């Protein structure tokens, strides 16, 4: 005998967590983790409200009607879990926690002696531009900024779910060439 | 329509800074 | 008399739509709309599963226990709706459908005679780099690409929820300066 | 571990292209 109140409680909590994740501003680094963390809790809630509801359908005998729908739900949950495992594999591979935080498709990366830079990126392009500067010294790509702790390697690489695209450093645009004070531009070209 | 935008501009940032102050020692 | 089966049906459908939105790849433009559209449906479902559950609590008289929780849910839904209205105001202001599609914090924009460019961006930076090139002619910022239909204006602006930051075109890095063939770099500096 | 990645690489893109073909005339 599974009481129906737990389903309502799970529904209310899941609504709370959807409402929280749908309004969190993605400005600072701490929010992103929060923005991820809430989702994680939500996912658990999304599981808890699902199987319990399924446990009701078998309890009421109304499970033969929508077994396909719940099978689809479980299949998509398995796909999402595999996606999370791939993200964990990427962040282990990129030596940083950025892949779990940011939701970008790709991650341009380069490893130094002490620090490893893993900056999110939309898609593989012919060229990649990195802007080094301060107000704090940092490297910025497409708005995403990472506090620099060392120089830039002439081989930068873009990680992906299934792509590993190396890039070649061609030119470094110093302030004299560009005319913009306190801003260094590094340009990388996609190696064939 | 811009009056509401001007009023609502910095209140969200102030709330986020309050959250910063509250949960800084928690994480 | 509100039957309890509708709550289970809404739960199942909401789980389906969470599962769909949590796996959609954000590579092409059509997916983004889909990725948004599903969310829209989900939001309706998130409403439908909520109030109905609330309608059960008043039906069972167990509403006095968690009125605060549902009030919080409704308050957060109101905040999310206001956020969507601000996004609609932005896309009306930016003359493009990109703000409703992309989830970036800011949008760098510039208006031409025939076409209007509204490219997503993370945060306001000192400089902004735009890469013009083909394989198709387009302007690319931080991986996000938009098919170019005209030139670039020397005044580019960044839209935001509450920020309107103008930028000044300082230098144009042509292929001779950079050494990268078929790639033009436009550099904008933030006006004070 | 890389064998699964190699196997799963292009199947997702092929499925997305199938979706492209199916729903191109719908939107």
Residue numbers in the entry:
A (entry chain B), C (entry chain A): 40 to 174, 181 to 237
B (entry chain D), D (entry chain C): 25 to 51
The authors write:
The severe acute respiratory syndrome associated coronavirus 2 (SARS-CoV-2) and SARS-CoV-1 accessory protein Orf3a colocalizes with markers of the plasma membrane, endocytic pathway, and Golgi apparatus. Cryo-EM structures of both SARS-CoV-2 and SARS-CoV-1 Orf3a display a narrow constriction and the presence of a positively charged aqueous vestibule, which would not favor cation permeation. To explain this difference, we find that a divergent, unstructured loop of SARS-CoV-2 Orf3a facilitates its binding with VPS39, a HOPS complex tethering protein involved in late endosome and autophagosome fusion with lysosomes.
SARS-CoV-1 Orf3a does not have an obvious pore in its current conformational state, and its aqueous vestibule is also electrostatically positive. Further supporting the idea of two distinct lipid bound states, we observe pronounced electron density for the MSP1D1 scaffold protein in this dataset and built a model. This difference between the SARS-CoV-1 and SARS-CoV-2 Orf3a MSP1D1-containing nanodisc structures likely reflects a variation in particle heterogeneity between the datasets and not a distinction between Orf3a proteins. We reason that Orf3a is not engaged with both molecules simultaneously due to steric clashes with R122 and between the two DOPE headgroups, as well as differences in lipid density presence or absence between the cryo-EM datasets. This is consistent with the published cryo-EM structure of SARS-CoV-2 Orf3a, in which the authors observed density in Lipid Site 1 and high-resolution density for the MSP1D1 scaffold protein, as we observe in our SARS-CoV-1 Orf3a map. A comparison of the surface electrostatic potential in this putative region of VPS39 binding highlights an acidic region of SARS-CoV-1 Orf3a which is neutral on the SARS-CoV-2 Orf3a surface. In contrast, SARS-CoV-1 Orf3a does not cause the same cellular phenotype and does not interact with VPS39.
